[PDB]
PDB file of C-alpha atoms in Angstrom:
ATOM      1  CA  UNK A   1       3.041   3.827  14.685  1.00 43.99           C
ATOM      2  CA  UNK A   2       4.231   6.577  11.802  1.00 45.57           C
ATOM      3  CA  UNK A   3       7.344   5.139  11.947  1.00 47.10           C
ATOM      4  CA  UNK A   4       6.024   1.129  11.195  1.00 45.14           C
ATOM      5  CA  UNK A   5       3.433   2.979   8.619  1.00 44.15           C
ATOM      6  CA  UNK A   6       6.447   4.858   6.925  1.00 47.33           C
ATOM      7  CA  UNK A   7       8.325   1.608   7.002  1.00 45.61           C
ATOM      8  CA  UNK A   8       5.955  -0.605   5.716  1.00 48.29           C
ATOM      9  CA  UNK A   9       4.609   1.809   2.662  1.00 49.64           C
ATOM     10  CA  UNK A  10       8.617   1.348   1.801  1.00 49.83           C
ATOM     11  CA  UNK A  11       8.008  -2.341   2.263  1.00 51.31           C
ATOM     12  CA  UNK A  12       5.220  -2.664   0.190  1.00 47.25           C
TER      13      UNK A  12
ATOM     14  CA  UNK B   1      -0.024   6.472   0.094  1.00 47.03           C
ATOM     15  CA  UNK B   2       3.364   7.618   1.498  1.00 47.00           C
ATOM     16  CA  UNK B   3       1.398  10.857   1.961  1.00 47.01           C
ATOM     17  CA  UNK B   4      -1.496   9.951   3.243  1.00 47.27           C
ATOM     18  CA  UNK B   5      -0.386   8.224   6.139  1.00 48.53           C
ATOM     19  CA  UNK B   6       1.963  11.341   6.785  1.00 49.23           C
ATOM     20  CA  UNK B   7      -1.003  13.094   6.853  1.00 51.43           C
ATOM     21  CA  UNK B   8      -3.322  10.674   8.917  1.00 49.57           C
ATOM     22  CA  UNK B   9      -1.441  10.347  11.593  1.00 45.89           C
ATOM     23  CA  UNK B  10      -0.806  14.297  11.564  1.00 44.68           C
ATOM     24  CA  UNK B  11      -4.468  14.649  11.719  1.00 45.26           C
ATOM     25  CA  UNK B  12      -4.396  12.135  14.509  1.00 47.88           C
TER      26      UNK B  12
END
């Protein structure tokens, strides 16, 4: 779940 | 908010 957080900050 | 969710899921 970081990971998908981390990516979807970037994905805005 | 990148940083916060670093942090939040450091905190746990």
């Amino acid at each position: 779940e970081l990971l998908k957080k981390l990516l979807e900050e970037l994905k805005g």
